[PDB]
Design a protein around this motif. Structure first.
Motif, PDB file in Angstrom:
ATOM      1  N   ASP A 153      19.576 -18.429  65.193  1.00 18.14           N
ATOM      2  CA  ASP A 153      20.190 -17.104  65.158  1.00 18.14           C
ATOM      3  C   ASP A 153      19.227 -16.053  64.622  1.00 18.14           C
ATOM      4  O   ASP A 153      19.370 -14.873  64.958  1.00 18.14           O
ATOM      5  N   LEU A 154      18.255 -16.451  63.795  1.00 17.75           N
ATOM      6  CA  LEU A 154      17.212 -15.527  63.361  1.00 17.75           C
ATOM      7  C   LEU A 154      16.186 -15.257  64.450  1.00 17.75           C
ATOM      8  O   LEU A 154      15.375 -14.338  64.295  1.00 17.75           O
ATOM      9  N   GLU A 155      16.215 -16.020  65.542  1.00 18.36           N
ATOM     10  CA  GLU A 155      15.242 -15.889  66.616  1.00 18.36           C
ATOM     11  C   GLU A 155      13.839 -16.179  66.093  1.00 18.36           C
ATOM     12  O   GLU A 155      12.990 -15.287  65.998  1.00 18.36           O
ATOM     13  N   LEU A 156      13.605 -17.430  65.715  1.00 23.76           N
ATOM     14  CA  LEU A 156      12.346 -17.859  65.120  1.00 23.76           C
ATOM     15  C   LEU A 156      11.247 -17.924  66.187  1.00 23.76           C
ATOM     16  O   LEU A 156      11.476 -17.636  67.365  1.00 23.76           O
ATOM     17  N   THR A 157      10.037 -18.325  65.779  1.00 27.61           N
ATOM     18  CA  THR A 157       8.873 -18.432  66.649  1.00 27.61           C
ATOM     19  C   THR A 157       8.497 -19.903  66.788  1.00 27.61           C
ATOM     20  O   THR A 157       8.862 -20.736  65.953  1.00 27.61           O
ATOM     21  N   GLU A 206       8.673 -22.009  48.060  1.00 25.45           N
ATOM     22  CA  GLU A 206       7.555 -21.480  48.840  1.00 25.45           C
ATOM     23  C   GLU A 206       6.370 -22.439  48.856  1.00 25.45           C
ATOM     24  O   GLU A 206       5.837 -22.764  49.922  1.00 25.45           O
ATOM     25  N   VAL A 207       5.924 -22.889  47.680  1.00 24.56           N
ATOM     26  CA  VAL A 207       4.772 -23.786  47.614  1.00 24.56           C
ATOM     27  C   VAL A 207       5.074 -25.107  48.308  1.00 24.56           C
ATOM     28  O   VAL A 207       4.164 -25.776  48.811  1.00 24.56           O
ATOM     29  N   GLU A 208       6.349 -25.498  48.367  1.00 25.42           N
ATOM     30  CA  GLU A 208       6.739 -26.637  49.189  1.00 25.42           C
ATOM     31  C   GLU A 208       6.555 -26.362  50.677  1.00 25.42           C
ATOM     32  O   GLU A 208       6.587 -27.309  51.471  1.00 25.42           O
ATOM     33  N   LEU A 209       6.367 -25.101  51.073  1.00 25.39           N
ATOM     34  CA  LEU A 209       6.077 -24.738  52.453  1.00 25.39           C
ATOM     35  C   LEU A 209       4.581 -24.556  52.696  1.00 25.39           C
ATOM     36  O   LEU A 209       4.065 -25.003  53.728  1.00 25.39           O
ATOM     37  N   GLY A 236       0.426 -21.374  56.698  1.00 27.35           N
ATOM     38  CA  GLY A 236      -0.542 -20.754  55.817  1.00 27.35           C
ATOM     39  C   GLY A 236      -0.132 -19.377  55.363  1.00 27.35           C
ATOM     40  O   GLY A 236       0.753 -19.220  54.521  1.00 27.35           O
ATOM     41  N   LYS A 237      -0.789 -18.366  55.923  1.00 20.75           N
ATOM     42  CA  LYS A 237      -0.544 -16.985  55.515  1.00 20.75           C
ATOM     43  C   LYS A 237       0.745 -16.437  56.119  1.00 20.75           C
ATOM     44  O   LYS A 237       1.664 -16.040  55.397  1.00 20.75           O
ATOM     45  N   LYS A 238       0.831 -16.417  57.448  1.00 16.03           N
ATOM     46  CA  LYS A 238       1.662 -15.416  58.107  1.00 16.03           C
ATOM     47  C   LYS A 238       3.092 -15.879  58.375  1.00 16.03           C
ATOM     48  O   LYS A 238       4.002 -15.037  58.442  1.00 16.03           O
ATOM     49  N   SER A 239       3.311 -17.184  58.570  1.00 12.47           N
ATOM     50  CA  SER A 239       4.676 -17.696  58.666  1.00 12.47           C
ATOM     51  C   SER A 239       5.509 -17.218  57.485  1.00 12.47           C
ATOM     52  O   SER A 239       6.576 -16.624  57.663  1.00 12.47           O
ATOM     53  N   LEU A 240       4.987 -17.405  56.269  1.00 11.29           N
ATOM     54  CA  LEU A 240       5.659 -16.938  55.060  1.00 11.29           C
ATOM     55  C   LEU A 240       5.880 -15.427  55.096  1.00 11.29           C
ATOM     56  O   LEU A 240       6.926 -14.933  54.652  1.00 11.29           O
ATOM     57  N   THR A 241       4.917 -14.682  55.646  1.00 10.04           N
ATOM     58  CA  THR A 241       5.039 -13.230  55.734  1.00 10.04           C
ATOM     59  C   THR A 241       6.271 -12.824  56.544  1.00 10.04           C
ATOM     60  O   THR A 241       7.198 -12.189  56.020  1.00 10.04           O
ATOM     61  N   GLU A 242       6.317 -13.200  57.827  1.00  8.02           N
ATOM     62  CA  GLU A 242       7.416 -12.711  58.661  1.00  8.02           C
ATOM     63  C   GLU A 242       8.737 -13.435  58.427  1.00  8.02           C
ATOM     64  O   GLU A 242       9.794 -12.846  58.688  1.00  8.02           O
ATOM     65  N   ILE A 243       8.729 -14.680  57.947  1.00 10.18           N
ATOM     66  CA  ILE A 243      10.002 -15.285  57.564  1.00 10.18           C
ATOM     67  C   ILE A 243      10.553 -14.561  56.344  1.00 10.18           C
ATOM     68  O   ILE A 243      11.768 -14.338  56.233  1.00 10.18           O
TER      69      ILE A 243
END
Length: 75
Positions: free
Chosen positions: A10-14, A37-40, A47-54
């Motif tokens: 429903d969030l329309e992930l990538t 977060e650190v578990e991710l 790495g960088k950007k998944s955490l950014t846009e999620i």
DNA sequence: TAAAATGTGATCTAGATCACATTTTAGGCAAAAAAGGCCTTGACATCCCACCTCACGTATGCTATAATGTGTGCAGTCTGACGCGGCG
């Protein structure tokens, strides 16, 4: 909440982030927010950007990361 | 004048000093490689298409004792004025 119990599509992930989620046995959004977060970051492909846009989309629909549950799972 | 403020000074006590060797570790610059984006391939699955396809349905033909003018179940008649065609 009514939004705890949704699948994440429903969030329309990538696709890359989706592979990261299914790779790590993360089923419910109640299972998402219980993860930290650190578990991710240590995990594959996150790495960088998944955490950014999620972080962006969870900032959009009114929730956040790393929160704590109790009486989970009611299934 | 009640009640709070003010001197005894020796004996201490948790941090700062202070020059120099060794880590680290950035952070940020070059990038290897992997996983999307791009395309392809093989393999399947489901068809669209149509191409047929036989049974059932349908359009048409005669039947030689003889038989020969309807009616047929209705209307109930409203009425006052106006045209028109006979009607003398």
């Amino acid at each position: 909440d009514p939004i705890l119990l949704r699948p994440v599509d429903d969030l329309e992930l990538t696709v890359r982030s989706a592979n990261c989620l299914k790779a790590e046995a993360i089923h419910y959004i109640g299972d998402l927010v219980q993860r930290t977060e650190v578990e991710l970051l240590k995990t594959p492909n996150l790495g960088k950007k998944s955490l950014t846009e999620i972080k962006d989309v969870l900032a959009s629909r009114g929730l956040s990361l790393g929160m704590r549950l109790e009486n989970w799972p009611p299934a």
